[PDB]
Design an enzyme around this catalytic site. Sequence first.
Site, PDB file in Angstrom:
ATOM      1  N   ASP A 120       0.748  -1.267   0.000  1.00  0.00           N
ATOM      2  CA  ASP A 120       0.000   0.000   0.000  1.00  0.00           C
ATOM      3  C   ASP A 120       0.781   1.321   0.000  1.00  0.00           C
ATOM      4  O   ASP A 120       0.445   2.247   0.737  1.00  0.00           O
ATOM      5  CB  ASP A 120      -1.021   0.002   1.136  1.00  0.00           C
ATOM      6  CG  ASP A 120      -2.193  -0.915   0.865  1.00  0.00           C
ATOM      7  OD1 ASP A 120      -2.985  -0.605  -0.053  1.00  0.00           O
ATOM      8  OD2 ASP A 120      -2.323  -1.938   1.570  1.00  0.00           O
ATOM      9  N   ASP A 147       0.631   3.950  -1.628  1.00  0.00           N
ATOM     10  CA  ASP A 147      -0.107   4.890  -2.480  1.00  0.00           C
ATOM     11  C   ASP A 147       0.523   6.276  -2.442  1.00  0.00           C
ATOM     12  O   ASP A 147       1.138   6.663  -1.448  1.00  0.00           O
ATOM     13  CB  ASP A 147      -1.554   5.030  -2.004  1.00  0.00           C
ATOM     14  CG  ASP A 147      -2.345   3.784  -2.196  1.00  0.00           C
ATOM     15  OD1 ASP A 147      -3.004   3.656  -3.246  1.00  0.00           O
ATOM     16  OD2 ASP A 147      -2.313   2.928  -1.295  1.00  0.00           O
ATOM     17  N   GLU A 204       1.968   1.363  -6.548  1.00  0.00           N
ATOM     18  CA  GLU A 204       0.603   1.504  -6.062  1.00  0.00           C
ATOM     19  C   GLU A 204      -0.100   2.646  -6.810  1.00  0.00           C
ATOM     20  O   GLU A 204       0.478   3.251  -7.724  1.00  0.00           O
ATOM     21  CB  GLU A 204       0.587   1.732  -4.547  1.00  0.00           C
ATOM     22  CG  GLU A 204       0.160   0.518  -3.734  1.00  0.00           C
ATOM     23  CD  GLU A 204      -1.293   0.119  -3.956  1.00  0.00           C
ATOM     24  OE1 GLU A 204      -2.014   0.801  -4.714  1.00  0.00           O
ATOM     25  OE2 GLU A 204      -1.729  -0.890  -3.361  1.00  0.00           O
ATOM     26  N   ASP A 239      -6.090   6.925  -4.817  1.00  0.00           N
ATOM     27  CA  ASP A 239      -7.159   6.005  -4.476  1.00  0.00           C
ATOM     28  C   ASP A 239      -8.111   6.709  -3.533  1.00  0.00           C
ATOM     29  O   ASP A 239      -7.677   7.423  -2.639  1.00  0.00           O
ATOM     30  CB  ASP A 239      -6.618   4.745  -3.818  1.00  0.00           C
ATOM     31  CG  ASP A 239      -6.318   3.657  -4.814  1.00  0.00           C
ATOM     32  OD1 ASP A 239      -6.598   3.834  -6.018  1.00  0.00           O
ATOM     33  OD2 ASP A 239      -5.801   2.609  -4.390  1.00  0.00           O
ATOM     34  N   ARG A 276      -8.071   2.937 -14.488  1.00  0.00           N
ATOM     35  CA  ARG A 276      -8.712   3.659 -13.377  1.00  0.00           C
ATOM     36  C   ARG A 276      -8.663   5.180 -13.386  1.00  0.00           C
ATOM     37  O   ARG A 276      -8.112   5.802 -12.473  1.00  0.00           O
ATOM     38  CB  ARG A 276      -8.178   3.124 -12.049  1.00  0.00           C
ATOM     39  CG  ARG A 276      -8.337   1.632 -11.940  1.00  0.00           C
ATOM     40  CD  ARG A 276      -7.520   1.057 -10.839  1.00  0.00           C
ATOM     41  NE  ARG A 276      -7.604  -0.395 -10.847  1.00  0.00           N
ATOM     42  CZ  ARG A 276      -7.186  -1.163  -9.850  1.00  0.00           C
ATOM     43  NH1 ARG A 276      -6.660  -0.606  -8.764  1.00  0.00           N
ATOM     44  NH2 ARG A 276      -7.269  -2.483  -9.944  1.00  0.00           N
TER      45      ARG A 276
HETATM   46 CA   LIG Z   1      -3.988   1.436  -3.012  1.00  0.00          CA
END
Ligand SMILES: [Ca+2]
EC number: 4.2.2.2
Length: 352
Positions: A129, A131, A166, A170, A218
Amino acid sequence: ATDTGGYAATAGGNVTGAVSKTATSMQDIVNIIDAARLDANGKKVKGGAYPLVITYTGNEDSLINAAAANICGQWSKDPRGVEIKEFTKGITIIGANGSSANFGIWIKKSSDVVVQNMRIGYLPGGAKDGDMIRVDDSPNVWVDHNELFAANHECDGTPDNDTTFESAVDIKGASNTVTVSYNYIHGVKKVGLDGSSSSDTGRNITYHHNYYNDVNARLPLQRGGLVHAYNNLYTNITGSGLNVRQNGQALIENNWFEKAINPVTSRYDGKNFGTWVLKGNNITKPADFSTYSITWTADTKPYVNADSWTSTGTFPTVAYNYSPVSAQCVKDKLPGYAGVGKNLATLTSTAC
Ligand SMILES: [Ca+2]
């Protein structure tokens, strides 16, 4: 004002009685936020003791260069980031011109957060993670004028073959209103979620004047709620762009797509397709697919593509105020407004 050009209405830490702190490093940001939790006596105040405006002057270019030099070595390293947990007094983290970070910002259960002028690239810990920007359970967040990048590449041996790097932005949980704007996002495989899973549906998010270049998927991966995407420049989309899922509604307007595969689609679940309203983009009908190198693919599960380039649903009346420029203008002008070092400059019709 709290005007962000999207769903979020916030001034971050730029409010009355705000404390101005200069952070020379990641640790400096961590320490400032921690001190900000105590009052005059040293007793903790819930949500923070006062508003913060942190100017990050640190520069971690050596680390970003090192990470770019061996991108597959990034996934296994420890992830780095400044967690902004339960800080509700209003906080603004802005990078100084020339500042750079090899760490991300992680917003959790907060509100009224603004992140501007931050150059975040090639972050370690894609498997754990790492990010670049994360917004979870945080409404009224403004992610504006940042440069988020890495390598739009997947290495072999990564856990789940999806963790080389990552995400860029998000968004999940109850981040009820968020505005992602004027960000230069390039070389990023998984750009950003809008819901961590099929059940995490909702939120009202606005993506405007963002410059996506050489990204895979995304933009965002929408799960429920509302997504208003306007004046975004989407070039070189190697996988899919806006993926409208779990019955989410999108309004795609005045955007400039080019050299993009599956720019507007609903795939990977096989059900509960979202809808889109298409207006004022550089592509108006399928005839422009050849002109702007727009391509479409299928999927192993039931999906829906905007190959007909017609609206598949409707969209509620836009709440906030915004004045969008033509698709051609985003194509022309946007590359000089999006990102860091633009002194947070905005694109107006006057500049077209
Ligand atoms: Ca993430």
